Design a protein around this ligand. Sequence first.
Ligand code: ISJ
Lengths: 171, 171, 171, 171
Amino acid sequence: EDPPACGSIVPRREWRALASECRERLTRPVRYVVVSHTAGSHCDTPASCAQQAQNVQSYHVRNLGWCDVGYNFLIGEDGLVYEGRGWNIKGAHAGPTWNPISIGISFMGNYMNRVPPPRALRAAQNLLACGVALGALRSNYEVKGHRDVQPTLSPGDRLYEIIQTWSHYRA
Amino acid sequence: EDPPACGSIVPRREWRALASECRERLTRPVRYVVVSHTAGSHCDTPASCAQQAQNVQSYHVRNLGWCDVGYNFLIGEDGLVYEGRGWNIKGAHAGPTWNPISIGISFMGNYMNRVPPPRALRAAQNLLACGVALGALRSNYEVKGHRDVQPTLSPGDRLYEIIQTWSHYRA
Amino acid sequence: EDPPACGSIVPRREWRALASECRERLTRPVRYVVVSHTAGSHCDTPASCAQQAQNVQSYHVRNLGWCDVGYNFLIGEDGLVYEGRGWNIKGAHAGPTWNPISIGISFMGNYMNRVPPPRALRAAQNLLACGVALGALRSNYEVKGHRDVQPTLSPGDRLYEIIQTWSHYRA
Amino acid sequence: EDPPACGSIVPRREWRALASECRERLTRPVRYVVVSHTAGSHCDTPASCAQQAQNVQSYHVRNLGWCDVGYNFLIGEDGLVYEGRGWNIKGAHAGPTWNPISIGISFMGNYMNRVPPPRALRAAQNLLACGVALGALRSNYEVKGHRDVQPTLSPGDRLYEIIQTWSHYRA
Ligand SMILES: C=C(O[C@@H]1C=C(C(=O)O)C=C[C@H]1O)C(=O)O
């Protein structure tokens, strides 16, 4: 109903991110969301996840020489949403075709032979509600698996099976 | 103007490929090579690897709608090399920066918890030798891992391990 | 199959186009759109534009002996789409590597030191958007300028700058 | 600021329109489309048709003192759609039992002893189909004539006889 109607998000400074150097912005409302999964180690405390997230960022910044973490948003299993590039800055997470037309959310961990916990899934679906509410996402936005637009296993077999159930998934 | 044939490569027709609708060209000599696994399941026979390559091309063109299979070449556990987009046409295998300036060779299978059979390395290594003999690749080309230039587990742990020991590999 | 009510194209009859003798089809769906200009007189009224089109088809039929107007569509500074060969038949607009696999659309003028009006850019953009919707185009279709695929100044220098900015523009 | 497409509409500021001051919104998805004719002067080029859309707003804003041009959309004989109040703002074009339940499109001119060229009829048709895509118009839209609902002669005898021959027309 009300303007800032949403989202319990761990901001950058909180998980101690490096400064985002990125500039290329997105066009709202965004139509597409791509679900990814870091495929690496997985956390479950505000404390271990805030670490997790920061590793990840570091990797994409230092090793691959990028301007900030690939994703716009990372879901922890602590149940929290770790802020990535956010709703307005174009991601680097799913090919040159989808990055300027999608929001990229990554479950932190590896879900080929596991599921993220109930609450991880809530954080994210809620985050998407939040995104629509703020006009970042088109009301009828579609959700694609990462393997749906990239050669990849991401977002893992189990998690994929789950997002394929969602109201907004459009194969 | 020496003719050093070194193409023990299974041609597209032999592994029975759909047609590349890909048209954009890499300028030769190409300076970098990026090694990726498919992270699919392995094939150990020309007859299965024929099918395997059929499918990898299929996942790229059908589900992803790509001009044609992402890689310039595919290595098999059958010890044979498969014609991807070959030496001249730009791949789609490492994203907008490396794509135009690298050959993306890809091992067919998943190497978090395997190593590719010695014959698969031999095929791979020699392929490059071949690549240099023609002028496709620079005498002094540098080899990256897939994870080195894009967030992914590709080319797999045990294989990543191995290609780091390789001569032409670069930090 | 699913048919919308897409576009506002001026059918051949209306701009008084001759009968086409053209008979060769393209494969659905076309991956490429190639943007050009006519480098001739610029029309800006629906009337003078209808002429311009007819003028162009003419020079293509009675002078180059082609089966039709060269372009699949034409585009008025009047802000209207002119039906040429259409979505299904082959254009004669960009060399024989490119004609069999593309859609040529051609702005009606000389855009070396001029911009097309905003209304013409919308026509084009919207006309494309349609193709996709009709399934005449791939959704991930790729736009190139004439000069990308032939040695020319088409689609004019100023229009060329403009098209580079486009979502689906691949260099 | 957008991939600029749907029904190739001329935007407000493009015809030099004084900013709306209107606030009442429509309840999407809207049921009715009331086709009127301005009853004023007819134009037939984009230049003359901007000057005409502008002239109507003037009479609505300066003289009658409405927050904006009455109709949601105007259709030029230049065969281009002029956006007045658009898809969301309630129109002032079909009275107070109809204004909150319909999109008011109007044809610039007097269609008693003439009809609008197909080029506008097409633009109009497309506008509605573009409406549905947006979800601003409900796919089973029903199209009434200005006289069907308000004692008046709009949209002219000759135009009115055409309207009834439309598919989604209900009498
Ligand atoms: C594809 C078109 O453009 C439209 C523009 C849209 C937008 O801007 O969000 C949404 C849907 C499309 O229907 C078209 O009408 O041809």
